[PDB]
Design a protein around this motif. Structure first.
Motif: not given
Lengths: 104, 104, 104, 104, 104, 104, 104, 104, 104, 104
Positions: F57-80
């Protein structure tokens, strides 16, 4: 009032997965002047301390219980209900039973 | 008349999902002068307190029951019917059975 | 009143395309003196913050929803209607469902 | 008499396009002296409030309905007919079904 | 305070797979001046030494326990909880029970 | 605060295609004087390091996620929002889920 | 630091096709003077030696992995990531898992 | 306090020979003025009523028991011990177990 | 410190002949001024109360015991030894075992 | 060094007749200055305390024993031999076996 809390963490078929056994200070209280309104609650301080010890759970995502005379896991989340929970202390051991909050 | 209410929350196949065990003050009443017409009802104060404790349900969306002599979950929603519900108290424990109001 | 908002962004067949999970401060309010008439509204501050996080949508071009007891996506755009939306918060998670405003 | 109105806006094949869920105060009434003849009507205040919430419709250009026991969308436009509409309230939810007034 | 720690490594059905028996120096401490804030913790030095001896486990991937009066394997991970663990020392032998951290 | 990040790269049906497992230093920070305004952000340094490791992958072209308590892939892009992502760390492993940004 | 590397070559359904078992000298290093900048890297010398032994693969066309605590084949290609790979050595056997680089 | 007493009369191998089931009025008491010192005792009135019903026994020649949590037939003959006996009432049924006083 | 004492009276082959179950107030004490030297002892008050309840024995002619961890009936007659007896209380039930003093 | 001594008093066929279970303070010692030569001995203080508790024996007329690894009742009367007796303490319980000194 030194009070020992033995926190059972329940698993799949309500079998204990991890036991922790800390100490708790419900009826004791800090300095007798108001730096705030009145602290947290005595149940809010309990659930903040159960969440601090167990690495397997995160705060706000667990339901603490106790066993009544019928053997049923009666839940408690209030601090006017924690006072009814603590009328079942046997020697000084207040056994609570932790269950996590899953899907449905 | 200190009266203990053990609120069973029923699940899928009428198996209990969460038990709460609070206290209730039906026959006791406030100051003997009218600040209103006459408060809420004794069944309206009960269902307002069952809804306050359980986080899993919201007020107006649950049906409280009791078991009669036949073992059937007789519902109650009135306060002239709560007086017939409370003639089944065993020691001082008034066991109610909560069911949520789904689609149909 | 710390309140977590889990913003689902719905896709083609009302399947979630991106989830965001921020925090919101409805009942909290700024300094108790008028630098303006009274700020923005509590629904105007919510939709200004949902539009700030998602890069896939632009402000003024999305409709925020919630699920009621029937499972229906009830929309809300007012701040006297956001108060009825927020009577469905479960633990502290206020799940909204975002849909974009297309042709017709 | 706090009364919740869940306004369904119907679409092409009588499928709901937008749901609104506000509150309504039919049997409540203002101050007990005549500043006018007698206000608007209880159906005139309802249709003035359904038109205020939905941005997709303009006042005077929609027909509000309800479902009777046969499942049919019975229309209502009068206030001696709104009293027959409101004898179908289930818990406190008065479900109306909005349809717009097109060509013919 | 010379203190012997007998580290049981538990296996499949909580039967011991490998026993190690080292010595530990909790209440003893180094030179009485601060080269750091205050070292590691007394539980952090214990789990760093249990991980150094066993070749079958890697640090950060094991849960150390102890037996209380009920026969239950109470876990400990803190150093205010290691002080409650060490009130069960019999002669000078502090028997801990190691379990590895698997899937779920 | 040494923090291990286990970067899952998701594939076609959200099955992991390549796993990377690096280390990250969010709460640690450089020298306590301003050579700039304040560095990059803690989420900007994370996504700059995930892009440096993966050759696919190349920078600026990917979306990082995480799993919450529901098992859903919640995305994040901010630092707050990365600070809400990192309240789900289990031991010290912060599992993120990488998805690439395709057509639509 | 004599370190044995057991190179599994994986096949169709991640079943091993050929095993090689050589020795590797990561922490050892040549003469303590600079005939170059500093050699190749410790991961560059590893992948140059895995490619030299297997006749079935050619250098630059294979991805070396390892198993973490979850059982997942975590890849590694860097030499600041090979140091995290080698914290999973069991006795002195560093098991890597080779996969070839096909179409997509 | 209407209290039902179910008097089991035990036989040879502590099997019940005759069951009687009367009602008892421990906490109720007569007119609130002293015609005597204070009546008989609450255990003296109980054993005077058990002897009145059974024709198979004569007063002063039987020992009344109860079952504790261990299943043991704990005897009682005092009225400061009858109050500990009556903390085992289940619904409103106070089961006592009568045994006659034989040779030795 | 409300403490329940369950007095077993042992018979021929150390089988229980009569059980009594009273309450005892060891750590509680009367008014904090000396009307005497210091009362009776805490073991002297216990054996004076066991002798008062049982009609089958006379004071000074019985030996009170307890069970230790080995299952042996350890006797106690002192009040510096009653404090070692009472470290075996399970919930709040202090089970003693009474044996009479016969010939030899 | 708090040390529990469980004094078995042996009977006819070396079966225990009375068990006492006191506490003993061998390695602890009084004030660090000489009010005498050096007190009594550590075995002289033990046999003076075993004689003080048992009413069935008089001082100077009993032989204290212990069990060695062979199961034999090894006697001890010296204080350089009590130190060999106390190398058989199991947890903190030093089991001695008392036998009286009869004719021959």
């Amino acid at each position: 009032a030194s009070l020992t809390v033995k926190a059972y963490l329940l698993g799949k078929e309500d079998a204990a997965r991890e036991i922790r056994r800390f100490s708790f200070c419900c009826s004791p209280e800090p300095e007798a002047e108001a730096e705030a309104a009145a602290g947290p609650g005595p149940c809010e301080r309990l659930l903040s301390r159960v969440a601090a010890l167990f690495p397997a759970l995160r705060p706000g995502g667990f339901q603490a219980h106790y066993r009544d005379e019928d053997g049923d896991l009666v839940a408690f989340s209030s601090d006017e209900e924690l006072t009814m929970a603590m009328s079942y202390v046997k020697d000084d051991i207040f056994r609570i039973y932790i269950k996590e909050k899953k899907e449905c």
